[PDB]
Symmetry: none
Subunit: 245 residues, 6 copies
């Protein structure tokens, strides 16, 4: 279908739910849903929820909270304790399931206790107690961008967030100390101009993953990065030859 019929589908689904709770991450999908909900139902029928957790950065949460206020939404912070579950804490291969369970269950309690008809998230085309309307309307990454520019949406988080769990090998126990170590290492690298980066944790070895197109530009920073991540507790600071992923 055309973008007009996909948008009309979205409006009808929203009109029928009447009052919604929106899982708000700050990326372009969730920003589109949140802004479409506000324009169809108005601020007082839309609660935006932003998850605050130890597995994502303080910077991403702060920008999301302020982004929802900029979009004109009542925004709420909720705090998740992902490490309270033994599967997540010990970083087993199915941790994604226990983490997403804890998230949507908290979001269901929020929407149940404020009278919302569903929880909305930003899943698109190409979690059963969530409605992903963009995927129900057959939106693709191309469509979300087309519809966002039409509404004048302009200020979402342009770099993808993933849980810090992925920086640790399966079986490694996540702790406050070693999560903080990875977060400070990745934060410093982003501060040098590398928004997409991974510091993979191998105890005394840091393995840095960069997009291969940036590795040439990184050379000027070797020695400063070496000394900075050593001051954080790594003994060996390395650059992965395979690049990012």
């Amino acid at each position: 279908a055309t973008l007009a019929t996909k948008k009309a589908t979205l409006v009808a689904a929203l009109k029928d739910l009447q009052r919604v709770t929106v899982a708000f991450s700050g990326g372009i999908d969730s920003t589109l849903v949140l802004k479409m909900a506000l324009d169809v139902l108005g601020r007082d029928n839309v609660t935006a929820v932003v998850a605050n957790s130890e597995l994502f950065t303080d910077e991403e949460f702060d920008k999301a909270m302020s982004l929802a206020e900029e979009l004109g939404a009542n925004v709420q912070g909720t705090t998740l304790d992902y490490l309270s579950d033994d599967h997540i804490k010990n970083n087993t291969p199915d941790s994604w399931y226990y983490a997403k369970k804890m998230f949507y269950s908290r979001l269901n309690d929020i929407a149940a206790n404020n009278g919302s008809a569903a929880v909305l998230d930003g899943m698109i085309k190409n979690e059963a107690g969530a409605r992903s309307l963009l995927q129900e309307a057959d939106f693709f990454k191309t469509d979300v961008r087309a519809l966002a520019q039409e509404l004048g949406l302009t200020n979402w988080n342009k770099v993808a967030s993933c849980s810090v769990s992925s920086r640790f090998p399966y079986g490694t126990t996540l702790t406050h100390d070693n999560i903080a170590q990875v977060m400070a290492a990745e934060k410093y690298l982003r501060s040098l101009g590398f928004p997409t980066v991974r510091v993979r944790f191998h105890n005394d070895i840091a393995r840095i993953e960069l997009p291969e197109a940036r590795i040439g530009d990184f050379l000027v920073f070797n020695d400063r990065v070496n000394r900075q991540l050593q001051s954080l507790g790594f003994r060996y600071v390395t650059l992965d030859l395979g690049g990012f992923r």
Copy 2:
């Protein structure tokens, strides 16, 4: 002139023409023309035509058709055999004209059989000879800023390319095989992060043109490119030292010696 009077000129020409067929590329100018024609004459008086060829990728054909449908237009696909004209197949320096003639001839066949008064294109101020293609934006004295002024004014925000003939030296015969070879090499290079790229074809040699500011970024990919483009059929994969568009970024002395050497 004022932007308000240039628009009134454009509507007068549209209202007077009653039924039109628009060559629609997906760029801002063809998008403006199509949307003004749709707004002045209504959906059942406007056929949007999108051309599919061997000289362009299927992806641009798909995105042009999606843009015309999203504008709410009756859209028609037509596919051309550019390689059946030997001025084009043998790639002489004027193939651009014989290609545009073949294109405008098919568009005038479409306009004759659907009862439209003219064929419209999106050429602005700063082929039609024998066809009768009217560039109403240029007839109403539109400039690139005026097209954007009217496009924001009408709520247009979603618009989208060069013929593959430019990748071959004059006299080299274009074939389905060597066209596909060039298109795949350019696509693979784009997938590595180089959106502006040309793979110039010299039979068994591939000559890659890059913006000079990216050549340093490219080195990590040399061996992968070399082996990828060798599997695409090139024997030698090379990088042009002048980069993409030679001379533009040189100093006033060697810009003048790089132009004299052309």
Copy 3:
């Protein structure tokens, strides 16, 4: 307060004024003011002014003019001669105050001659601005940078000048006296460098030495351009052309 009440105060202030002249830079603030004026008073009561001078590039002036026209405004270009004021010519710490004095004084002349009630600028929550009686309507209505963006999305604004282009005086040490020739030398050097793909760049002037500042993340990309930049900037009159090892700032 809410966005919509600060919007209403802003609409009220415009309605009373009827005819306005807008100092238009192209950044998010000036474009917000200009767009609120166009939508409250109509195109025929809103003159947008863009200043042209020796201390800024022809490229930034042309984009500001094109942005105002593209947003649907009647736009006017005014050329200021900042080097005729001794305070600016001598490159002292108060040169900016005299430059903005000369700007607001010209804008009050443009506004008298087209029948405008106020001069509007894009300041949000300064001595020259008040003395000239120019109005910061966003600042009166208690806008902050987040409100400016909230309102700009609400109105569908998505192009403004994201670069904060800076006066060329910052390329000279305090006390070095600006001339037409050494300004032109630096301006051509930065224009040449931007044309190679380096949009954020400074050519600091140390008499016969040019000291180029690049973001450290770009210096590797620069290597292929060493010899061309060396000869181009010498042909502009520098004896020595150098690259700062510390980078930008």
Copy 4:
């Protein structure tokens, strides 16, 4: 030079510890010249801790200098201090080396074992690398081994158990990296991680090889192939 000639003449029958390097090569012929080919045997050790290419180049050079040459084979991994790579392993390895040479020299009637360190008669004659270079050409010597090697144990953490496999893995990886033009290189072994040390001035020249080195060192058994940002040392 006068000092060196004095000491060798007095030693009558000698055996030379032959490294293949320029210093060691001086001592062999320097001696062959004053004591005769029949009473100077050159021994070159074959081990798992040094490369086959360095062993093969040394022995043929001793014949090239005109010497009775012997290859003795040392099993350094038979010592538990070496096998487990403790901080004093250099001492237990050096004992096994010089003890095998004192067996060969005792057995063939050699009066001493000599090596090339600047008994180190070259160290006794106040030689430095420059003095060694002028005198070596002086007898028309032009062929040694220009790369002076270090034991493969330094590629392993203290406490890591050396095995035939993990040594071979390290040796093939460094051999590949040298083949690409990086003669000074270390492949430090961290189980599934390979950590490459290059001189910092070569790291830029290396970029063109990232992807090939990654795949080559994985096919050698590493899961992750990395480059140390601090560089060589």
Copy 5:
């Protein structure tokens, strides 16, 4: 099998010939033959010949000529016109054979008219022209050549064996006086920048430059200068091979 036995064999064969002419390249093998010939037969029975051609550079001919003087030998330069043979001129895969055939035949004109018994070259462990490889008949391997060179105090030879410029041309493209000079000047310019092992491969209007891959990073600073220099030499397009040297 010993070196001494191999040396004596070489000495015996030289004594037998009495008057010889040596094809002298400057490499270590041709230097060993020349020095052993001078020692066993004396200066007036040994002619050293150095070939001069369009297929090699002038400074490479001069360095071999000056090295032959350093050994104390009467050396004469001879110049070959390789481009006169169509097998070489049109660059067929057997062009190497006709060049070397033309080479050894000129050496036999010189050896006939100076009364020499054989033409000697340095092949180690031709057959048409009767040229003798005494190092090959004396069972020399690279280590024997090196051992004997040290014995005689030989330390000066060409360590970089030069290759005919024919390898810069594809099979079938015809060599001309101009396109050789074009390729040789291009390579000379690239060496002057600090890149000693390099090839400028010729593809009509395209130059395909081969560099060792580990130097390609170092090359970037010269791109534009190399581009314009080789265009001023007559190439329309100047390119760098992504596969590197001997791709």
Copy 6:
């Protein structure tokens, strides 16, 4: 003329002079003169003098004096105070002459005490440059230096530190030490050929252009180290070391007018 005949010219020249003094810098030229003199005249008639000054590093002095010992030459040190001359101390464009005159007067003052006839230097193609008289070129010195078994010279040319300062600048112990410490730090990093040009608070680093890409990994360490030595701004010259010598034909001629404009 072969090496053989030019060497005999040199050997003939040495025998006639009987007693010599050799200006020994440690480069390839002086080492050839010094080693040829000993082989013609013996250790009892070849006085070698090596100069120590404030304009050169202690590393050069010690490296030069050690070599004369290897060549078996009687070698003595002499110390020159170049900073006592106002032409050298204030670095005017003829500073080079008054420095070389002050050098040669010490070398001839010594000549009489030695009892030597002439004083010899390594000038190639009352001083005497026998290599220059015998028609030696840079290539001839290399061939004869191998034939005589010499492989020690100082392989990188060293020049007086005066060239690191603009004409008119007063040389001091403070600024000389600053320039020398900056250069030694850069040499310590793997760049044996380097210059730190002194422009008051600006350091301008000259590198051979083939090394500049290799330098990027040290930008930050060099920036901070040279600031600690007293420079405010640390910069890299875009023209490099010996600007123009390695440029294409057109742009070499253009950088040569740029040079001669000052």
